[PDB]
């Protein structure tokens, strides 16, 4: 079906402790495959999946060099952004960058992304046309005019429509049995009393990939829903709960939608 | 594979 490749970069300043922290992670869909950490021993882009390890030394030297170049840009950006907002040297600040590309069922380019944040807020982002910038405040409009002048959008659009899609297709063919799988959720319901007059019905989804999933209740209000969470073995988990008057649990149903399921499931508990 | 051409803010 539809696929994607994303890179996530986190850059954090450390006042009076020298070098800033730089962390970079690469995903294909919901599977992490590479990482870099400035605090790690290696100072190399490291593998985080079996299928990526078959890439030769040339790939690893290239990505390492590229990620070290990202960190240098980011190191400067922290100082530049400090100037724009007129902030002190003694405070820690965070920069984040996400970029990547989507592909459809036919593995052709669908969409591309390049977003940039400062202290957890939108700073500047590339629009869906890939020729144009949304600036979030006056400081980012300075960056907008600078990036328009240096033809940044054009250079990004070349990467996003070309290199990004070619390497995504390559990774999808190398890690075929990992990335092109679809594990359906294994589901069950638990019941617990909370009162003489009330009772909790919890609905579980376990061992599913990818993470996109919908759990909803139906009757024929007080609904709890946890954030989808990693099992730690590649698959994901989620539960949804409702507090229901006891003696009326039979009229409530849990509904599960997921691409691994050929049709969506309906779960019912009865006393 | 990562981006190559990066421009400062």
């Amino acid at each position, epitope marked *: 079906g539809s696929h994607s490749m994303r890179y996530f970069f986190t850059s954090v300043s450390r006042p009076g402790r020298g070098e800033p922290r730089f962390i970079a992670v690469g995903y294909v869909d919901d599977t992490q495959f590479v990482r870099f950490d400035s605090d790690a021993a290696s100072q190399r882009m490291e593998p985080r999946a079996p299928w990526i390890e078959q890439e030769g030394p040339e790939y690893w030297d290239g990505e390492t060099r590229k990620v070290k*170049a990202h960190s240098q840009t980011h190191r400067v950006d922290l100082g530049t952004l400090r100037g724009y907002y007129n902030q002190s040297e003694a405070g820690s600040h965070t920069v984040q960058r996400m970029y990547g590309c989507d592909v459809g069922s036919d593995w052709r380019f669908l969409r591309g992304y390049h977003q940039y944040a400062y202290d957890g807020k939108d700073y500047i982002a590339l629009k869906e046309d890939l020729r144009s910038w949304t600036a979030a405040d006056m400081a980012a409009q300075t960056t907008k005019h600078k990036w328009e002048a*240096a033809h940044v959008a054009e250079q990004l659009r070349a990467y996003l429509e070309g290199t990004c899609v070619e390497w995504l297709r390559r990774y999808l063919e190398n890690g075929k049995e990992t990335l092109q799988r679809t594990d359906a959720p294994k589901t069950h319901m638990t019941h617990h009393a909370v009162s003489d007059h009330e009772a909790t019905l919890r609905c579980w989804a376990l061992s599913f990939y990818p993470a996109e999933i919908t759990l909803t209740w139906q009757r024929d209000q007080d609904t709890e829903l946890v954030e989808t969470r990693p099992a730690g073995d590649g698959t994901f988990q989620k539960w949804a709960a409702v507090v229901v008057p006891s003696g009326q649990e039979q009229r409530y149903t849990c509904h599960v939608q997921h691409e691994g399921l050929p049709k969506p499931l309906t779960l019912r508990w009865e006393p | 594979s990562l981006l190559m051409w*990066i421009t*400062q803010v």
Partner: T-cell receptor
Amino acid sequence: EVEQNSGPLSVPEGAIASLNCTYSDRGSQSFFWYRQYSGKSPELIMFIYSDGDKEDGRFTAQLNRASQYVSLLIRDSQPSDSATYLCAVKSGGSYIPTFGRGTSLIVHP
Amino acid sequence: GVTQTPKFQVLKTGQSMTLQCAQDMNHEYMSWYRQDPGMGLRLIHYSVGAGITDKGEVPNGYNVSRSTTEDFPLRLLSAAPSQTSVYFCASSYLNRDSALDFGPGTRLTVLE
């Protein structure tokens, strides 16, 4: 990779100086002209990335991707344009620009 | 701009020396070229940022380090007569269209 005739090239004051530079890699993205006076450092004149002409005062960079060359034309050449002109090319698979050996230009007054 | 010291230097064969190169423009990329009469600019070492250095066309006999954004010193370990040359430091941003900015240069003569 990036080829340039060494010269010297002689041009009379007032005439057009025509400097050429070929390249082998079609994946080349941006193209640069630096000027180096004798005993001084190379200094940028201009860059070009899109096919066609680009004018900047008396200088005109010309890029032709089909025939794989970059040119620098200098209209109304003066004796102070006498220098070595260095061509450099940046490409897709590296951060290192590839330099030609440079062409020496003398403009006789 | 890009500064480098010293501008001229005489060494005897076997001596060590460090050519300084500093830039105040927050360039990520920094390089060291040598220029000799017949052979144009040849790359010695480069660095795309702090904590990484890489070999160029003619790295042998030279060392570099990049522990900061600004500085990119070139060490000559054991000076040889064939290292007699003009040495240029060159730095730039990482845009496609970023051009090198060259330092004033360092004329080195190594004698027996």
